[PDB]
Amino acid sequence: IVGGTASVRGEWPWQVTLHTTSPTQRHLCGGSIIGNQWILTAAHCFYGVESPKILRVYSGILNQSEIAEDTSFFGVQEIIIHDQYKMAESGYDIALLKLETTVNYTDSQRPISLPSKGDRNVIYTDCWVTGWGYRKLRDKIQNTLQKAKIPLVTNEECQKRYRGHKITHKMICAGYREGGKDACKGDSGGPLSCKHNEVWHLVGITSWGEGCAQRERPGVYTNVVEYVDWILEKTQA
Numbered sequence: 001i002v003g004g005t006a007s008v009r010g011e012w013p014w015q016v017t018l019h020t021t022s023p024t025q026r027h028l029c030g031g032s033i034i035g036n037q038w039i040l041t042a043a044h045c046f047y048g049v050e051s052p053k054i055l056r057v058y059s060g061i062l063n064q065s066e067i068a069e070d071t072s073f074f075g076v077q078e079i080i081i082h083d084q085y086k087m088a089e090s091g092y093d094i095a096l097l098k099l100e101t102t103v104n105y106t107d108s109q110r111p112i113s114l115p116s117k118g119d120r121n122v123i124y125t126d127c128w129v130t131g132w133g134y135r136k137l138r139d140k141i142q143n144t145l146q147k148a149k150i151p152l153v154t155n156e157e158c159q160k161r162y163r164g165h166k167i168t169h170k171m172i173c174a175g176y177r178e179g180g181k182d183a184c185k186g187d188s189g190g191p192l193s194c195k196h197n198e199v200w201h202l203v204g205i206t207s208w209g210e211g212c213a214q215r216e217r218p219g220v221y222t223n224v225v226e227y228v229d230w231i232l233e234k235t236q237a
């Protein structure tokens with residue numbers, strides 16, 4: 001996260017850090033608890049990933065340093081990538097992680113509510129992007145979970161900032177005209193959480209963008225509300 005600040009422990013209880021154990025363990029992407037055994041994240045996070053066996057999901061984390069060899073984690077039983085996904089910039093950058101065990105909800109770990117189709121006309125004015133991602137284009141994973149408030153921008157506007165791409169209705173953008181605050185490398189798969197009516201809603205999934213926090217270059221996120229039926233379909237046993 002660029003231009004953000006340290007989060008308060010348990011402030012974003014649905015936020016998980018997805019680690020890979022290959023070649024040595026390291027943070028790979030962000031993700032969001034949406035079910036007792038379901039993590040919603042970004043499909044592009046799995047480039048090269050051949051098996052769920054090398055994945056480890058850690059919940060209730062604030063600092064990466066909390067994560068050691070003796071720290072409990074959730075194994076991944078299945079990786080479900082949208083069959084229409086090809087690359088981040090094209091869309092359908094969404095994926096589900098079916099955990100090998102169920103998450104016991106608590107103040108440090110609980111699920112975030114999915115947006116409702118009737119919530120497509122709502123104007124979210126209190127959105128935040130979070131992650132252990134880069135603070136600078138060429139930096140490294142951050143120890144403490146960062147947060148940044150970022151206003152949403154209409155797709156028409158986003159399109160103007162990305163004339164080389166096609167911004168579809170299954171995408172949603174957020175950023176400041178002058179940049180300064182944005183998601184960056186390592187925040188991918190993480191949530192774009194918007195508080196509406198005293199309830200936090202998973203509005204988007206950190207997907208892509210040109211550089212980080214650049215002026216006139218909003219971050220592009222997967223528009224979650226467009227995938228509620230897909231999510232129901234893939235999670236319904």
Ligand SMILES: *[C@](=O)([C]([C][C][C][N]C([N])=[N])[N]C(=O)[C]N1C(=O)C([N][C]([C])[C])=[C]N=C1C1=[C][C]=C(Cl)C(Cl)=[C]1)C1=N[C]=[C]S1
Nearest residue numbers: 044047183184185186187188207208209210211212213219
């Ligand atoms: C994600 O942490 C980052 C988040 C960056 C979002 N940036 C922003 N709001 N300014 N994701 C990517 O870098 C995704 N991605 C891209 O955004 C582009 N953008 C073009 C316009 C330059 C290109 N390629 C990717 C991409 C990166 C990595 C993989 Cl493995 C794949 Cl398949 C695509 C992370 N995503 C992966 C690791 S960190």
